[PDB]
From a paper:
Each subunit of BFR possesses a dinuclear iron site (the ferroxidase center) that catalyzes the oxidation of Fe2+ to Fe3+ by dioxygen to endow the protein with its characteristic ferroxidase activity. The three-dimensional structure of BFR reveals the occurrence of eight 3-fold symmetry channels, six 4-fold symmetry channels, and 24 B-type channels, all of which are potential routes of iron entry.
The structure of the D132F variant confirms that the D132F substitution does not significantly change the overall structure of BFR or, most importantly, that of the dinuclear site where Phase 2 iron oxidation occurs. The position of residue 132 is critical for the blockage of the B-type channel in the D132F variant because the side chain is located at the constricting point of the channel. Substitution of Asp-132 with asparagine removes a negative charge without introducing steric hindrance and is insufficient to decrease iron oxidation rates substantially. This result confirms that the large decrease in iron oxidation activity exhibited by the D132F variant results from steric hindrance of the channel and not from elimination of the negative charge of the aspartyl residue.
Numbering used by the authors:
A (entry chain F), B (entry chain C), C (entry chain D), D (entry chain A), E (entry chain B), F (entry chain E), ...: 1 to 158
Write the structure that this text describes.
């Protein structure tokens, strides 16, 4: 079903955001894992998987709307070197991504692509949940100190 | 069954205490939650629920005794800005409420409303249990230091 | 995550509405219960519980957006003296609340806070379901007469 | 298998009756439901479903006999404005349809289409069961009065 | 609850679209069945059922909003004579309907009927899923040829 | 444990191959899905997942050996436009990847990194299995013709 | 089956390494246990058991190849006096052992004793897993501090 050209462009831009997040979160997860921070590995790895699910939704929607998914261009990753820097990088990435989503959601509404909009709002809802988690962790590092914080990550939280 | 007017006035005063506590504990709970202090959220939230149950008992008793439950007047909340201030505020609230409960229990006995008294003694027993928990938590903050204390709250206890 | 100030003000206004409904529905329920109208107590009590859930959603959303939930100011309750007056009062409360919600949902859209909007639309949907029930019960009082209507409430509808 | 042309015309006429009943009973059901008359909604909705099953049998039979099912022409609905008027309209509809069925069954026998006849007699048996329920309900409205009658519909009849 | 008059008119127009689709899909289904194309009968029949569910939602919403559901006027059916023509007819119907849905969704938003809007968006999401299926099947007819396509329909897919 | 620098360079090169395959196979998969070729979607999607697992093994091994995983550089994808072209592109990618693996396996042996070698041989064994599947499917397209081949993909194989 | 004499000498040397590790890890384990460091006792004890399993494989392989297993000569143990020193001693022991293993694996290949080689690669894979754990724990001591580190060992991890 032929979709709006600019909606398809937005979907490819958002897909682009997801491809960056997938790689950044996956590497951060395994860096966490390599440092023995099992709890952070677990959360970060599942964020990575969650972004794959988002990318999948963008890809299928683009194909349905008869556009061409772009998995070729990969934006800049920002891999941190310590736990706080890594989480702060994820947070900045999520905030950038949420700005893009808001714009796309607004535009999709204006050209009456309510199904694309509905999908993006669900994804945005997922992203704000991740933003909440990040902000909380970043504050906890300051509140309990880095040594306690790292100690709180070495066992899985199940 | 027409009750003693002053007993009903006491029950409305105690109900008023409960209405303040319900709101104060519920907001403190979600503030804890927003900070990632899942254990404190869990306890604080269930205290709020417990105060709803106490309010319910007062409301039903007042109606049975043919009085008019007053849910319209809401006393002063004292919302804290950090964990210790919030727990100290809850404790002061509990101690004030216990003073009121003691007065009512004495008065109900004097006019032979033993069923109202029996109800209030159970509630007082619940409140001293809460007072015990608060005093213990406040002492632990001092004994293990705030950083260790916050760390001990980020996972649910169960 | 720093939210829009006017959205946060809307959320606090809506929270204020919920705090009124919680108390109004709770007292109405126990009045129904005190009269032996078990069916009405059951529905009314669970509406009270449902408004607590709505308040909870507003409170968590406000805290996330870094605003201050206001549980201190309690609006006017309108407690009825007979079944029809109580239900009509609940209905007026719901209709007033729905106007406020519609306005907030519109504005949330205009500043691209689609997650707050999504939350509020779910709540509005709950409220219109409650309005449907109220309108139905009020009509049934007139159609079967008050004596039959009351008789129909004295046993639980499981 | 090439059927009798006039038999096919009868089946299309009967299908036409079913299409009317489907819509009339479906709307009547949801009007009942909207008024809180759950028992009537339940029965009326299932009659609508049963008329769909009848329509289905006609459609399949017509196609087998190599005729063209007519779903395009929709006869007059008679939507009532109150419960008694709605049930009396359903009853008149059933009686008109039973007349049509009797004529078709007689003709089908006459041209030796015994399988179409057998199908139609099963449907006629279903309809007389519905006519029985309607006559009963209409009599009960008079015998117990409308207020009692409506009270008896507000709960599901297990 | 008195709704917006034009929203109600939209809902009746959409209900009208559904009434056409119910009949068109039901007849197409049984034509498929009569040809031995069991897989197409199964999908097409369940589309008809799905459109009945959509109609039900419109009817109940209209009644809640105190309007009058119109089940009397039936728009033009376009019954195909071979498989490709039938599927293309369904597809044109779905596309026409999606246009109406988009228009209604935009208008409901403008008068703050967010619950009617939310219902319609769910329905639009369903229809685009049906549009996807239709486009796929039509392409498969071209890609594998009609003889292979028909062979692929004669057993149930499950 | 500080690894051999050139081994780490090989692992990053092989990771790079995996990153291309992950994206190429995922897009091909959903293209198959969009075409209704359910069997091909299922296989292609699971190949994509298998390459993610391989990438995961490289990333963890690089980190253990104290190198820096490179997820930033993404090589050329070769997305096909029809089924045969897509499978041939996958096959060329796999053959290129196997050449790189053979080189790396030889080199790792020469510097006594037997654990890296052992890991790569397992991965090579997986890739040759995929190569077998691709070559088989490509031959089958020619042997049964494209129309029969496409028909054989529209149902899941399980 | 008469084996290569030099391979057998390698197997006896590696067996000697295992005999040192078995005793060193067992004593470190019970020293940990005596200090109340239950998590470390658990891991260290199971490493000792794993080295017994490795020794067992060497002994059986040596006897099969018709050599004489040497369990008489025991190399130098390096028992640490505090947790960090003990772990660093284990790590140095593992690294020395891996050097010997790589050499033996290389030589087994040159004389085509591929089964001895295959056994040794599995053991090497085990040892690098142990090296990973050791490096991680040593880094965690510095990152969270010894006091937090010790606190993190007093309960079993399972």
């Amino acid at each position: 079903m032929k979709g709006d050209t600019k909606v398809i462009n937005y979907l490819n831009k958002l897909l682009g955001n997801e491809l960056v997040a997938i790689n950044q979160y996956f590497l951060h997860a395994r860096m966490f894992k390599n440092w023995g921070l099992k709890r952070l590995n677990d959360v970060e790895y599942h964020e990575s998987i969650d972004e794959m699910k988002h990318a999948d939704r963008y890809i299928e929607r683009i194909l349905f709307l008869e556009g061409l998914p772009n998995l070729q261009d990969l934006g800049k990753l920002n891999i941190g070197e310590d736990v706080e820097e890594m989480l702060r990088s994820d947070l900045a990435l999520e905030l950038d991504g949420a700005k893009n989503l808001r714009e796309a959601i607004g535009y999709a509404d204006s050209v009456h692509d309510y199904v694309s909009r509905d999908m993006m709002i669900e994804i945005l809802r997922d992203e704000e949940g991740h933003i909440f988690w990040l902000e909380t962790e970043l504050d906890l590092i300051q509140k309990m100190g880095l040594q306690n914080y790292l100690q709180a990550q070495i066992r899985e939280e199940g």
